[model samples]
Target chain A: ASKRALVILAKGAEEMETVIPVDVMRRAGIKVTVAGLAGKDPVQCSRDVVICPDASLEDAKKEGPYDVVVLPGGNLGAQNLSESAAVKEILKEQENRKGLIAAICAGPTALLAHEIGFGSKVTTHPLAKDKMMNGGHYTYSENRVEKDGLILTSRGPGTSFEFALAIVEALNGKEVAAQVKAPLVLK
Target chain B: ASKRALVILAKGAEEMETVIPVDVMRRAGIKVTVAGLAGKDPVQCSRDVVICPDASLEDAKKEGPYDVVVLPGGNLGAQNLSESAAVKEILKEQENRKGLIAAICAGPTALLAHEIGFGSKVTTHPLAKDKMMNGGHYTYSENRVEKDGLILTSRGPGTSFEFALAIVEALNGKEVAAQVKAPLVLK
Candidate 1:
């Protein structure tokens, strides 16, 4: 399989949250498509980094058969992304398809806002725990990445790699993920 | 004039350290270009996350004519970015043109490595002083962003917005930058 991933980029999306995983997954040989609201180009993250996306939300959802979908989180960005109908659709599709979904920092807030975190144990940037807790029953962890079933979560920027590694485990199995971990000295 | 900035996307760049400032600066309508090593994507501070860069080190230097060059410091990323040839050129240009340059965290190491911080009062990631002291005489402060002439620096991710705002101040004038800082509660 090509190991295609649908990475959503909504207005106010945390730039790094999106960039980090995409970089890691690409290194892992996974094809990552940065999807955006309306599935259009020149997506604006919180600051002003325009990420030219691969597809609009509508088109991306239709094109899948994707293996995973991710949401990047920040404060207002996370809030804006959660409210986006396009992002919500992607989340719903991932749920129906049993695809891996990862979010970090306030990114998980979108999952909670969309009610996607129900019954999913998740974590996020340390400052966002209260909101994550409100979204669902949450677990507090110092470990960068947290795997609770099909959903993966992580702490703030420091743990981005660990969070990314956890997602790699979900996609490629533990051995391959372990191999990837070695080069980065992540283990 | 198009407000200019230099964003350093060095290896092991801190998540928030790079992101907050990038976001804040872009919001202020500053022309923030990331100068780092060459690759398909921006070199990331975290393992898997790639910061989306405006230009590679080669490209930024080639473009020439820029105002401020910002350095968001992490350890590995800062070291690599500083050591890279392109960064050296950018530093040299800043000195030659008398343009502004700023850095945060271990980012100031790039300055130290290039011998730009000989007598300047600067700040960096809390541990920055320890590393910089070996190279120059510096005064450490608890302030998030510290200014000494054309140099602006900050402590860590917690202060990224502050750091960026200071650059905003340098370029757009204090009044406009003050407005941007108000919302973030960055004093």
Candidate 2:
């Protein structure tokens, strides 16, 4: 069966972080659901880009048990994700199942907030380092994309493609990732 | 005055190429208008990502002339862009005004369709080479990002950061571009 992914979309989310992964995963033949945190309404992204989600979190959950869960970050986007009970439950379930969970930039802080991947090596946007290291629950890395067991994380917008491709590599394989990367003209 | 940008968002446009530059350009403090070619409505991108345009091209044109005109590529998206009389008129006006015009991937094909910049060095997604070189009105380069005078072109999603930054540098300056680049964690 084809792999499935669940991307939790929240307000104030970074449009670039969200779009890059969703687009790339689809290219990799993964079925990705861009689920709105608030509901199935159009979300106004951090830079004012409006994105219409595929479904509301409440609706997307019915189709769950996804192979991976993705979180895309902006400061306020991460903040909203951190505060959601729905998000917390989702992350906790994913962790309990040992399913892959990936985040980028401020998104990792939500992992911290949800207490999902403590002790896993991860990375976040440099500016977000202090917040992520507050309790030192998880070791941090500066790698563009860091995957520790079931937890995968990366830095900012520049690392988004890397982050997405890593998701592809994890769910699919190296060959599929390489195939997807070539047409992109990535350096 | 702050530099203004007009991004012509058409049906079937590549969401990655479209969103990357829009997000990056806004991050650089450029005033960007995501204008829909069809009308003011949510556009379904090549990958099915739905984006609500900031304004219709008809309305955005009243607010021109912008500093740069950006075109993002998907094969079908380029075909749509290439067929629009509105796009042709806008590109022709921008070319006559000597404003910066940036296109990426199959987007450069629209430039050829509009006959905006003949005899300038350009680059396109490798898959689009034959189509872009059909008449050889412009010279093709293997460079990831190619800029000749006021015309700027790039390959595909991988080179999007470089393409956006080039637009930033051209409109803002090297320092602003450098400052913006740092936090993105780009390689």
Candidate 3:
């Protein structure tokens, strides 16, 4: 079986953060499911780009166990993810299984709310620093894309490409990542 | 008056290219309308990211004469754009009015198809170069983001942020571009 990724789609999620990873993962030949946290319907993003998810979180959950659980950051979107009881369980299960948990921008703060991965070095959007470091459970870093074991974090929309590629490298290996990267014409 | 942008959304458009510019422009205080090339309905993008457009191209045309008319790229999306009679008329009017026309990746090939901006040095996704250069009508540049007066072109997804910021700078000036760029944490 090939690698699979599940990207949580929440209202107000950063469109770039959500789309970049989903598109790039598919390009890397990873089966990606864009799961709507609320239900299977179109959700308007932070900047007003509405996206339709592949399936509802409940439906996707039935399939069980994904290689990577992706969280895209937007202030309100992450707040929504932070409040979901379903999200909490999914994240907890993933962390317990030692599967990769990736978050970007305000996304890492959801990890803080869920209490999933404490004591791991993490990073967030600079503006989200105070919120993420509230309890001092995890150390902070300024690296653009910070990976500490199974927990991966990256800053804003500008870093989405780097963040997504890092996920591809983690799932499909460097050769696959390089093959995907070459056509992108990254500067 | 604040600047305004019109982003044409075609089925199979690269979600990253479409969403990035729209978001960045909105952050820069531009009023952007995501117009569906086919209609107001949601479009399934190249990567299977479905995006609901704000209005149909027919409706967006009535509110037309925006500060910039943006074209996002994907092979099929660009092909659809290239084949649209409605799209041709809009670009022609925009050019006739001496307005700004911005495109990215294969988006520029639509310009080539429309005969809109020949003689301007432009760039496109590497794979699209030969297609773009077939007639030698326009001089080519490998610049990540290429701007030849009113015709602005950029490479693929990686250059989208750069391409978008260039649009912001052109429309809102460097101060606004820098102000907006700071929070994005671009590397």
Every model: Cα RMSD to truth: 8.0, 0.7, 0.8
Q: Better model by TM-score, 1 or 2?
A: 2
- lDDT by residue (A1-187, candidate 2, tens digit) is 9999999999999999999999999999999999999999999999999999999999999899999999999999999999999999999999999899999999999998999889989899999999999999999899999999999999999999999999999999999999998888888
Chain A of candidate 1 compared with the true chain A, TM-score: 0.88
Arrange candidates by DockQ, descending.
Answer: 2, 3, 1
DockQ of candidate 1 relative to the true structure: 0.14
lDDT of 2: 0.95
Q: TM-score of predicted model 1?
A: 0.60
Which sections of candidate 2 miss by over 4 Å? Answer: none
Q: What do the candidate models score in CA lDDT, each in turn? A: 0.71, 0.95, 0.95
| Number of the candidate with higher lDDT, 1 or 2 | 2
Alpha carbon lDDT at B159, candidate 2: 94
Q: What is the TM-score of model 2 when looking only at chain B?
A: 0.99
Which stretch of 10 consecutive residues in model 1 chain B shows the poorest summed lDDT? B178-187
lDDT string, candidate 1, A138-185, tens digits = 656645677888788876644666667677778877886777665432
**Looking at model 3 chain A, which ten-residue stretch has the lowest summed lDDT?**
A178-187
Pairs that clash in candidate 3: none
Name the 10 consecutive residues with the lowest summed lDDT in model 2 chain A. Answer: A178-187
Per-residue alpha-carbon lDDT of candidate 1 for residues B1-187, written as tens digits (9 for 90 to 100): 6787767676677655676677777768877776656653745455344455776667776676677887766688788867887778778779778888888878887887887756777777666678877744666665667888877777765465667778888888889887766543221
Error of 3 at A177 (Å): 1.1
